[PDB]
Design a protein around this ligand. Structure first.
Ligand SMILES: O=c1cc(C2CC2)[nH]c(=O)[nH]1
Ligand SMILES: [Cl-]
Length: 149
């Protein structure tokens, strides 16, 4: 048969890279995240220009792990003045709401043939934190993540 679900012109998709496995667990538990100052600025702009016309998806991967670990949607703008030190390292300023919609490990081998024309045609699996994913490649990534078993 066929699965044409992801094949939608409104939506923006970003890679999230975490050094910390603990912080992934905490994000899933409490449905919150924080990036760097410049990453927060990037995500906040995308969320606030989307005006709720479509989702901002976050594709999570722990640095060095060899796999993605799940997918969340942004659910709020960035609040830059929040309690410090709630994450494994005290390196972060602020907080935004997410909603994890998918938690499972997807090996990089399933995804490394998808390349990002906006990042020198490097594999999507070689991205840095808050690398944006072109929509047509994001649809391919989401289908692979959803279909993996
Ligand atoms: O390793 C990390 C850990 C976090 C915590 C959520 C703040 N954020 C990030 O971008 N990388
Ligand atoms: Cl695009």
């Amino acid at each position: 048969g066929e699965n044409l679900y992801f094949q939608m012109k409104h939506g923006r998709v970003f890679i999230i890279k975490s050094y910390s496995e603990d912080d992934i667990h905490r994000s899933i538990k409490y449905n919150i995240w924080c990036s760097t100052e410049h990453g927060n600025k990037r995500l906040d702009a995308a969320y606030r220009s989307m005006n709720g016309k479509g989702p901002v998806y976050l594709l999570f991967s722990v640095n060095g792990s060899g796999h993605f670990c799940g997918v969340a949607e942004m659910k709020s703008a960035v609040d830059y003045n929040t309690c410090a030190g709630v994450w494994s390292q005290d390196k972060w300023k602020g907080r935004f709401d997410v909603r994890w919609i998918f938690v499972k490990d997807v090996p990089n081998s399933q995804l490394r043939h998808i390349r990002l024309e906006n990042n020198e045609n490097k594999p999507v699996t070689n991205s840095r934190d808050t690398q944006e994913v072109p929509l047509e490649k994001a649809k391919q990534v989401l289908k692979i993540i959803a279909s993996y078993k």
